């Protein structure tokens, strides 16, 4: 078997003649998030593109931070709208990125400011 | 002098980002071979150099999208009332019905556009966040005019904002306040026509995706080349031959693959430079044309500029420039100044015209004939010096009340 | 990185020319000399290409900075967000090591107030439109103010200009227009 990329992907077993698909196994990279050696030593390690306190993200697999329902401006980016920061004793936390603060203008037919 | 006008809307597409990629040099060059990695250790630091270049490209690509859209620091909300003095913004405003907070034009645009050591990193900003930015900018433009571009937003009725906008190009407010329904109908019809036109175009956004795919495919295909060696597969070279002789083949393979990787990274960096330039231009357009009227000719669309509504597209931004264009003109006879009592009377703001039997003064862009008066004109110079002068009487408002 | 590139053997015997020259005879010397030369040449080519691209980007930034110095400093700029944030008044250049620093002096409104406005005024069956200001009402009277800074004035025939009729417009209200000629009739 082959793909458009000219690499073997499908192999038929000669012994009993069924079809087997070959997929590359567990390939990615490691990344470490730190808040600076001048303040603390705790770090959080992120494996990207790998399906695994373990929190699952759309950017991979992140270990060392816990999810929070709260929202903050981004400090240390991760990917796919996820960010981390040291400030909460103090542990690394991952929060969904938030954009600005909600505000609604009072627009009427005959009102000006 | 023009006597009628039509409103038209034209699109503009500017790419702002390209796919962020990274490559594991050891996996690409040598695969899972043990001796190949040992032999590859001779060169050194090439992998670090390549990875640094790729990472710099990726962070620049993220920063471009961060810069182009994040202009406001306050998320705005569209008011529930949909009355805008006859203007129909249903097509471009966000639709809560759809599962994703994307408007009709965004949805139509998105549909229209269509593993050996290589990885693709996801963007920092998801599509929902970009759509939220776009909706906030659209609402800020609609409700607050240009005020929210500088400081706290200030609400203002849409009709008055349009009257202000004509006042920028050099036409009085009466031309709007007396022809509001016509303008609303023309704008809605133009929006609908553009919506139909986009249904069947593009080509700038499809370029970057195709180029990236072609480059990656070419690299993967180049994986299998022999590069002057006897066999492409490393496993055959290791098993079949004597270890002393296999080193020459391994060296040929690694040299060729390294050169191909260098070519790929140079091409990517060259293209990223151009993408950065285009993103800078798009950011400038976003800042100037949208957050306020633009006096620059043709910078924000052919014809006089009124406003523009940004829209989101895959790896890019699609604009909607609104322009004013004079429709129909009539021949007229003009004079520089009128001599009344030996003194010239130069017009204050308009240009003097003649029906063929009398004389009138009117604004340049729109034919609005007005009777001559001392209020509309000032006095300077003498009758002799002027190159061309016509004889006519100047009406004075003070004389009638002398009873 | 360019300097560190020296210590790589590139597949030859050693990364130093002196050791190769003394240990081997001229007939066998070239086998390592060319191996070293190819690698060093490749390193130089990579360095020069990187420098070429970085110089191009720096030149783009320098052109942008020259444009900003020409436009913001030597005259007021009407472009939005080109010269600082907000309305722009003036800017002062300052120097820095391999860079330039600007101080845009901007203008931003602070305190806004609720108001009720009408597009035009129908005084005696003839529409009235403000020349520069906008009609604003306190709830008991009507005023005209310049759009940016609040400063009420009474409507006068020298503030508005008559045009059209009372039927065509959409937004319209009734109010008397002060006539400066009337007291002059005494
Ligand atoms: C990881 O694998 C599990 C196993 O079925 C699956 O349920 C889950 O959706 C996977 N997650 C990702 C992000 O692929
Ligand atoms: C303005 O719109 C409101 C909608 O609630 C309507 O009740 C009112 O009559 C309108 N006034 C004018 C002057 O258009
Ligand atoms: C301008 O063109 C429109 C197009 O139908 C027309 O309805 C309108 O009457 C024209 N303007 C004048 C002043 O005739
Ligand atoms: C705006 O246009 C849409 C598109 O047909 C229409 O469904 C809607 O009723 C229009 N809104 C108004 C207020 O006419
Ligand atoms: C305009 O051109 C005609 C052509 O001969 C000439 O007679 C007339 O004097 C010109 N008028 C001016 C004001 O130049
Ligand atoms: C305008 O009037 C003066 C005074 O009567 C006269 O001399 C002059 O010729 C007139 N202009 C023309 C173009 O005839
Ligand atoms: C402005 O005043 C009107 C009536 O005086 C009021 O209905 C409206 O709520 C006020 N605006 C705000 C933002 O409170
Ligand atoms: C203004 O006065 C006219 C004259 O009678 C009247 O018809 C109109 O309704 C008035 N407008 C108001 C009260 O808003």
Numbering used by the authors:
A (entry chain A): 566 to 617, 641 to 676, 689 to 713
B (entry chain B): 714 to 827, 855 to 940, 944 to 1146
C (entry chain A): 961 to 1146
Task: List sentences from the manuscript.
The SARS-CoV-2 spike glycoprotein is the major surface antigen of the virus. Its function is to bind the host receptor ACE2 and mediate the subsequent membrane fusion required for cell entry. Recently emerging variants of SARS-CoV-2 have acquired other substitutions in the spike including a number located at the monomer-monomer interfaces, at the receptor-binding site, and near the furin-cleavage site.
Third, the most striking feature of the structure of Beta spike revealed by cryoEM is that all the trimers adopt an open conformation. This is in contrast to our earlier study, under the same conditions, that showed 83% of Wuhan spike particles were in the closed form. Inspection of the sequence of the Beta spike and comparison of its structure with that of the closed form of Wuhan spike and the open and closed forms of G614 spikes, suggests that the opening of Beta spike could be driven by the substitution K417N on the background of G614 (both also observed in the Omicron variant spike). In Wuhan, Lysine at residue 417 on the RBD not only makes an aliphatic packing interaction with Tyr-369 of the neighbouring subunit, it also forms a salt bridge/hydrogen bond network with Glu-406 and Arg-403 of the RBD and with Ser-373 of the neighbouring RBD that stabilises the closed conformation. In contrast, the substitution of an asparagine at position 417 in Beta removes an intramolecular salt bridge and would generate a steric clash with Tyr-369 of the neighbouring RBD leading to destabilisation of the closed form and thus promotion of the open form. In the Beta variant spike, the presence of a new substitution, K417N (also observed in the Omicron variant), in combination with the D614G, stabilises a more open spike trimer, a conformation required for receptor binding.
